A paper describes a structure:
Copper-dependent lytic polysaccharide monooxygenases (LPMOs) classified in Auxiliary Activity (AA) families are considered indispensable as synergistic partners for cellulolytic enzymes to saccharify recalcitrant lignocellulosic plant biomass. In this study, we characterized two fungal oxidoreductases from the new AA16 family. Further, we showed that both AA16 proteins are able to oxidize low-molecular-weight reductants to produce H2O2.
The copper binding site appears to be identical to the one observed in AA9, AA11, AA13, AA15, AA17, and some AA10 members with the His-brace providing three equatorial ligands and an additional Tyr axial ligand with typical distances from the copper to the N ligands (1.8–2.3 Å) and a longer distance to the Tyr–OH (2.7 Å). The methylation of His1 is confirmed in the structure. In the crystal, a carboxylic residue from a neighboring molecule blocks the equatorial position to the copper, expecting to bind water in solution. There is no visible axial ligand, presumably due to photoreduction of the Cu(II) to Cu(I) under X-ray exposure. Second coordination sphere residues include a Gln, which is in the same position as an important and conserved Gln in AA9,57 while the conserved second coordination sphere His from AA9 is substituted by an Asn. At the surface of MtAA16A, another Tyr residue (Tyr27) can be found near the His-brace but lies sideways rather than parallel to the protein surface. Thus, MtAA16A does not seem to possess a likely polysaccharide-binding surface adjacent to the His-brace but rather a small pocket, which could be speculated to interact with small aromatics like syringol, on which we have demonstrated activity.
Author numbering: 1 to 113, 120 to 168
The structure:
Amino acid sequence: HAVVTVPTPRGAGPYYTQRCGETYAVYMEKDKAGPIENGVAKAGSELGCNPFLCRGYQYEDNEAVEYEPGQVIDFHVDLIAGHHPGYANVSIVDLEANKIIGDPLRSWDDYPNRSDIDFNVTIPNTLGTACSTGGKCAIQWYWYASGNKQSYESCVDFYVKA
Ligand SMILES: *[C@@H]1O[C@H](CO)[C@@H](O[C@@H]2O[C@H](CO)[C@@H](O[C@@H]3O[C@H](CO[C@H]4O[C@H](CO)[C@@H](O)[C@H](O[C@H]5O[C@H](CO)[C@@H](O)[C@H](O)[C@@H]5O)[C@@H]4O)[C@@H](O)[C@H](O[C@H]4O[C@H](CO)[C@@H](O)[C@H](O)[C@@H]4O[C@H]4O[C@H](CO)[C@@H](O)[C@H](O)[C@@H]4O)[C@@H]3O)[C@H](O)[C@H]2NC(C)=O)[C@H](O)[C@H]1NC(C)=O
Ligand SMILES: *[C@@H]1O[C@H](CO)[C@@H](O)[C@H](O)[C@H]1NC(C)=O
Ligand SMILES: [Cu+2]
Protein backbone atom coordinates (compact mmCIF):
# COMPACT_ATOMS: atom_id res chain seq x y z
CA HIS A 1 0.00 0.00 0.00
CA ALA A 2 1.54 3.28 -1.17
CA VAL A 3 0.86 6.55 -3.12
CA VAL A 4 2.90 9.67 -4.22
CA THR A 5 2.08 12.84 -2.13
CA VAL A 6 4.75 15.16 -3.69
CA PRO A 7 4.41 16.45 -6.25
CA THR A 8 0.55 16.48 -5.96
CA PRO A 9 -0.42 13.63 -8.35
CA ARG A 10 -3.72 13.24 -10.32
CA GLY A 11 -6.75 12.72 -8.03
CA ALA A 12 -10.47 11.92 -8.41
CA GLY A 13 -12.84 14.24 -10.33
CA PRO A 14 -16.02 14.21 -12.48
CA TYR A 15 -14.48 12.59 -15.63
CA TYR A 16 -12.95 9.86 -13.35
CA THR A 17 -16.41 8.82 -11.98
CA GLN A 18 -18.02 9.23 -15.48
CA ARG A 19 -15.38 7.19 -17.37
CA CYS A 20 -14.37 4.47 -14.80
CA GLY A 21 -17.88 4.14 -13.28
CA GLU A 22 -19.20 4.52 -9.67
CA THR A 23 -18.02 1.01 -8.61
CA TYR A 24 -14.30 1.57 -9.54
CA ALA A 25 -14.25 5.28 -8.42
CA VAL A 26 -15.91 4.56 -5.00
CA TYR A 27 -13.80 1.43 -4.19
CA MET A 28 -10.48 3.08 -5.20
CA GLU A 29 -11.17 6.36 -3.23
CA LYS A 30 -11.92 4.54 0.11
CA ASP A 31 -8.08 3.79 0.00
CA LYS A 32 -6.05 6.03 -2.39
CA ALA A 33 -3.05 3.72 -1.53
CA GLY A 34 -4.79 0.42 -2.43
CA PRO A 35 -3.72 -1.69 -5.43
CA ILE A 36 -5.50 -1.51 -8.85
CA GLU A 37 -6.45 -5.23 -9.33
CA ASN A 38 -8.95 -5.14 -6.41
CA GLY A 39 -10.83 -2.21 -8.06
CA VAL A 40 -10.79 -3.90 -11.51
CA ALA A 41 -12.22 -7.09 -9.90
CA LYS A 42 -15.00 -5.19 -7.99
CA ALA A 43 -15.91 -3.12 -11.12
CA GLY A 44 -16.04 -6.15 -13.48
CA SER A 45 -17.85 -5.18 -16.77
CA GLU A 46 -18.85 -1.66 -15.38
CA LEU A 47 -15.21 -0.42 -15.80
CA GLY A 48 -14.73 2.01 -18.77
CA CYS A 49 -11.21 3.54 -18.18
CA ASN A 50 -7.66 2.03 -18.29
CA PRO A 51 -6.90 1.62 -14.53
CA PHE A 52 -3.27 0.63 -15.43
CA LEU A 53 -2.68 4.21 -16.72
CA CYS A 54 -2.58 6.74 -13.82
CA ARG A 55 -4.78 4.45 -11.68
CA GLY A 56 -7.66 5.51 -14.05
CA TYR A 57 -7.36 9.22 -13.01
CA GLN A 58 -8.16 11.51 -16.00
CA TYR A 59 -6.26 14.54 -17.43
CA GLU A 60 -9.45 16.73 -17.66
CA ASP A 61 -9.90 16.42 -13.82
CA ASN A 62 -6.28 17.73 -13.20
CA GLU A 63 -3.85 20.49 -14.38
CA ALA A 64 -0.33 20.02 -15.90
CA VAL A 65 2.59 21.95 -14.21
CA GLU A 66 5.47 23.58 -16.27
CA TYR A 67 8.98 21.98 -16.01
CA GLU A 68 12.28 23.00 -17.76
CA PRO A 69 14.66 20.53 -19.49
CA GLY A 70 17.20 19.24 -16.87
CA GLN A 71 14.94 20.42 -13.97
CA VAL A 72 15.14 18.17 -10.82
CA ILE A 73 11.78 17.24 -9.13
CA ASP A 74 11.69 15.86 -5.52
CA PHE A 75 9.17 12.94 -5.05
CA HIS A 76 7.74 11.72 -1.72
CA VAL A 77 5.88 8.35 -1.56
CA ASP A 78 3.55 7.80 1.44
CA LEU A 79 4.22 4.05 2.14
CA ILE A 80 1.32 2.56 4.25
CA ALA A 81 2.45 -1.12 3.89
CA GLY A 82 5.65 -2.57 2.37
CA HIS A 83 5.42 -5.79 0.27
CA HIS A 84 8.37 -8.08 -0.68
CA PRO A 85 9.40 -9.01 -3.26
CA GLY A 86 8.59 -6.41 -5.97
CA TYR A 87 10.01 -3.73 -8.36
CA ALA A 88 9.17 -0.12 -9.30
CA ASN A 89 10.02 2.50 -11.92
CA VAL A 90 9.24 6.24 -12.46
CA SER A 91 9.10 7.01 -16.21
CA ILE A 92 7.66 9.64 -18.61
CA VAL A 93 4.63 8.06 -20.35
CA ASP A 94 3.04 9.30 -23.60
CA LEU A 95 -0.64 9.42 -22.44
CA GLU A 96 -2.14 8.99 -25.99
CA ALA A 97 -0.26 5.68 -26.75
CA ASN A 98 0.31 4.53 -23.06
CA LYS A 99 4.04 3.95 -23.98
CA ILE A 100 7.16 5.20 -22.09
CA ILE A 101 9.26 8.01 -23.71
CA GLY A 102 13.02 7.22 -23.54
CA ASP A 103 14.42 5.49 -20.41
CA PRO A 104 13.04 5.18 -16.87
CA LEU A 105 13.98 8.33 -14.87
CA ARG A 106 14.42 5.87 -11.91
CA SER A 107 14.36 2.04 -11.59
CA TRP A 108 14.39 -0.25 -8.49
CA ASP A 109 14.93 -4.04 -9.00
CA ASP A 110 13.79 -4.45 -5.32
CA TYR A 111 11.03 -2.09 -4.01
CA PRO A 112 10.49 -0.97 -1.38
CA ASN A 113 13.61 -1.30 0.89
CA ARG A 114 15.43 5.71 2.23
CA SER A 115 16.10 6.33 -1.53
CA ASP A 116 12.74 4.51 -2.27
CA ILE A 117 10.11 6.79 -0.52
CA ASP A 118 12.16 10.06 -0.79
CA PHE A 119 13.85 10.38 -4.23
CA ASN A 120 14.23 12.85 -7.17
CA VAL A 121 14.18 12.62 -11.02
CA THR A 122 15.57 14.89 -13.79
CA ILE A 123 13.60 16.03 -16.91
CA PRO A 124 15.62 14.98 -20.03
CA ASN A 125 16.87 17.54 -22.67
CA THR A 126 15.93 15.01 -25.43
CA LEU A 127 12.06 15.31 -25.24
CA GLY A 128 11.64 17.36 -28.50
CA THR A 129 8.03 18.64 -28.93
CA ALA A 130 6.59 15.38 -27.43
CA CYS A 131 5.50 17.07 -24.11
CA SER A 132 5.03 20.64 -25.52
CA THR A 133 1.50 21.10 -23.95
CA GLY A 134 -0.71 19.81 -21.09
CA GLY A 135 -2.21 16.30 -21.44
CA LYS A 136 0.48 14.86 -23.80
CA CYS A 137 2.83 13.43 -21.05
CA ALA A 138 2.87 12.50 -17.34
CA ILE A 139 5.48 11.15 -14.87
CA GLN A 140 4.06 7.74 -13.73
CA TRP A 141 5.32 6.15 -10.49
CA TYR A 142 4.60 2.40 -10.89
CA TRP A 143 5.15 -0.31 -8.20
CA TYR A 144 4.48 -4.05 -8.77
CA ALA A 145 4.37 -6.11 -5.54
CA SER A 146 5.20 -9.49 -7.26
CA GLY A 147 4.65 -11.28 -3.87
CA ASN A 148 0.95 -10.12 -3.88
CA LYS A 149 0.50 -9.57 -7.72
CA GLN A 150 -0.53 -5.98 -6.82
CA SER A 151 -0.03 -2.79 -8.96
CA TYR A 152 0.33 0.74 -7.47
CA GLU A 153 0.33 3.92 -9.70
CA SER A 154 0.42 7.74 -9.34
CA CYS A 155 0.73 10.37 -12.18
CA VAL A 156 2.02 14.00 -12.38
CA ASP A 157 0.83 15.85 -15.54
CA PHE A 158 3.46 18.29 -16.91
CA TYR A 159 4.56 20.12 -20.12
CA VAL A 160 8.01 21.36 -21.29
CA LYS A 161 7.98 24.26 -23.88
CA ALA A 162 9.74 22.86 -27.03
C1 LIG B 1 7.69 0.42 -15.41
O1 LIG B 1 6.49 1.12 -15.10
C2 LIG B 1 5.56 1.00 -16.15
C3 LIG B 1 4.42 2.00 -16.02
O2 LIG B 1 4.95 3.33 -16.16
C4 LIG B 1 5.11 -0.44 -16.24
O3 LIG B 1 4.43 -0.53 -17.47
C5 LIG B 1 3.07 -0.86 -17.36
O4 LIG B 1 2.94 -2.23 -16.98
C6 LIG B 1 1.56 -2.62 -16.92
C7 LIG B 1 1.55 -4.06 -16.50
O5 LIG B 1 2.31 -4.77 -17.46
C8 LIG B 1 0.83 -2.36 -18.25
O6 LIG B 1 -0.56 -2.61 -18.06
C9 LIG B 1 -0.96 -3.71 -18.85
O7 LIG B 1 -0.84 -3.43 -20.24
C10 LIG B 1 -1.08 -4.61 -21.01
C11 LIG B 1 -0.59 -4.48 -22.46
O8 LIG B 1 -1.49 -3.77 -23.35
C12 LIG B 1 -1.47 -2.84 -24.33
O9 LIG B 1 -1.34 -3.28 -25.71
C13 LIG B 1 -1.85 -2.50 -26.83
C14 LIG B 1 -0.78 -1.69 -27.59
O10 LIG B 1 0.00 -0.87 -26.71
C15 LIG B 1 -2.97 -1.55 -26.42
O11 LIG B 1 -3.90 -1.39 -27.51
C16 LIG B 1 -3.69 -2.10 -25.21
O12 LIG B 1 -4.81 -1.25 -24.97
C17 LIG B 1 -6.05 -1.95 -25.15
O13 LIG B 1 -6.64 -2.35 -23.90
C18 LIG B 1 -6.83 -1.24 -23.00
C19 LIG B 1 -7.21 -1.72 -21.60
O14 LIG B 1 -6.33 -2.79 -21.25
C20 LIG B 1 -7.89 -0.32 -23.61
O15 LIG B 1 -8.11 0.78 -22.69
C21 LIG B 1 -7.48 0.12 -25.04
O16 LIG B 1 -8.57 0.75 -25.73
C22 LIG B 1 -6.93 -1.00 -25.97
O17 LIG B 1 -7.91 -1.76 -26.74
C23 LIG B 1 -2.78 -2.11 -23.98
O18 LIG B 1 -2.52 -0.79 -23.45
C24 LIG B 1 -2.56 -4.93 -20.81
O19 LIG B 1 -2.83 -6.12 -21.51
C25 LIG B 1 -2.83 -5.20 -19.33
O20 LIG B 1 -4.19 -5.55 -19.05
C26 LIG B 1 -4.67 -6.79 -19.09
O21 LIG B 1 -4.56 -7.27 -17.77
C27 LIG B 1 -5.45 -6.73 -16.78
C28 LIG B 1 -5.34 -7.51 -15.48
O22 LIG B 1 -3.95 -7.67 -15.15
C29 LIG B 1 -6.90 -6.78 -17.22
O23 LIG B 1 -7.66 -5.95 -16.34
C30 LIG B 1 -7.09 -6.28 -18.64
O24 LIG B 1 -8.43 -6.60 -19.04
C31 LIG B 1 -6.09 -6.86 -19.63
O25 LIG B 1 -6.44 -8.22 -19.96
C32 LIG B 1 -6.24 -8.75 -21.18
O26 LIG B 1 -5.03 -9.52 -21.23
C33 LIG B 1 -4.97 -10.65 -20.35
C34 LIG B 1 -3.66 -11.38 -20.58
O27 LIG B 1 -2.69 -10.67 -19.82
C35 LIG B 1 -6.14 -11.58 -20.58
O28 LIG B 1 -6.16 -12.49 -19.49
C36 LIG B 1 -7.45 -10.79 -20.64
O29 LIG B 1 -8.56 -11.64 -20.89
C37 LIG B 1 -7.35 -9.67 -21.70
O30 LIG B 1 -7.07 -10.11 -23.06
C38 LIG B 1 -2.40 -4.00 -18.51
O31 LIG B 1 -3.20 -2.84 -18.77
C39 LIG B 1 0.96 -0.89 -18.59
O32 LIG B 1 0.21 -0.51 -19.74
C40 LIG B 1 2.42 -0.55 -18.69
N1 LIG B 1 2.50 0.87 -18.89
C41 LIG B 1 3.31 1.51 -19.71
C42 LIG B 1 4.23 0.71 -20.58
O33 LIG B 1 3.30 2.75 -19.73
C43 LIG B 1 6.29 -1.32 -16.44
O34 LIG B 1 5.85 -2.67 -16.40
C44 LIG B 1 7.37 -1.04 -15.42
N2 LIG B 1 8.58 -1.80 -15.68
C45 LIG B 1 9.47 -2.03 -14.70
C46 LIG B 1 10.68 -2.87 -14.96
O35 LIG B 1 9.32 -1.59 -13.59
C1 LIG C 1 18.74 13.93 -5.99
O1 LIG C 1 18.95 12.60 -5.51
C2 LIG C 1 20.28 12.24 -5.13
C3 LIG C 1 20.28 10.79 -4.68
O2 LIG C 1 19.76 10.78 -3.35
C4 LIG C 1 20.67 13.21 -4.03
O3 LIG C 1 21.85 12.79 -3.33
C5 LIG C 1 20.81 14.55 -4.75
O4 LIG C 1 21.53 15.51 -3.97
C6 LIG C 1 19.38 15.00 -5.10
N1 LIG C 1 19.37 16.30 -5.77
C7 LIG C 1 18.60 17.36 -5.46
C8 LIG C 1 18.82 18.58 -6.32
O5 LIG C 1 17.78 17.36 -4.55
CU1 LIG D 1 -0.42 -3.00 0.24
